[PDB]
Amino acid sequence: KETAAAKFERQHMDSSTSAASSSNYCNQMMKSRNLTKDRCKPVNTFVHESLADVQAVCSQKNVACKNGQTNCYQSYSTMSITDCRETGSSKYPNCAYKTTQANKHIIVACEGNPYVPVHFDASV
Numbered sequence: 463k464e465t466a467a468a469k470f471e472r473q474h475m476d477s478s479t480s481a482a483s484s485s486n487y488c489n490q491m492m493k494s495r496n497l498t499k500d501r502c503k504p505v506n507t508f509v510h511e512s513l514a515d516v517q518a519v520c521s522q523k524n525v526a527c528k529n530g531q532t533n534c535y536q537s538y539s540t541m542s543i544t545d546c547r548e549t550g551s552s553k554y555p556n557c558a559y560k561t562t563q564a565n566k567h568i569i570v571a572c573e574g575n576p577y578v579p580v581h582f583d584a585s586v
């Protein structure tokens with residue numbers, strides 16, 4: 463079965479590209495990472511840094527999670543990311559997304575042993 467750590471990697475890691483996300487990027491990535499299988503996942507962020515750099519965030523700046531839990535961490539450095547946001551005319555199964563590249567500090571929730579990212583909370 464898929465671990466929470468693996469699920470974070472599938473939903474949120476894309477080290478392979480630096481940013482260059484075409485306007486098509488989210489349409490393709492949301493589908494291929496299986497985030498459009500059951501419904502159109504409304505919002506999702508992919509991070510284009512190494513897995514080591516993203517895992518490292520779990521030992522960086524401790525901040526409150528949006529849900530009030532205390533296990534979130536904000537990257538000290540900005541990171542290359544792409545936000546995917548479902549369009550207003552998007553209708554499942556043909557899920558459609560606006561693709562927006564940015565360089566921002568990521569906030570992730572970490573859990574487990576080893577202590578690794580399991581949710582993407584926000585970018586700031």
Ligand SMILES: O=c1ccn(Cc2cn([C@@H]3O[C@@H](CO)[C@H](O)[C@H]3O)nn2)c(=O)[nH]1
Nearest residue numbers: 469473505506507580581582583584585
């Ligand atoms: O700027 C953002 C803000 C929220 N999110 C949501 C998210 C959370 N997660 C975490 O892992 C998923 C495991 O099912 C959950 O939806 C959430 O805990 N995945 N996507 C962004 O991707 N970018």
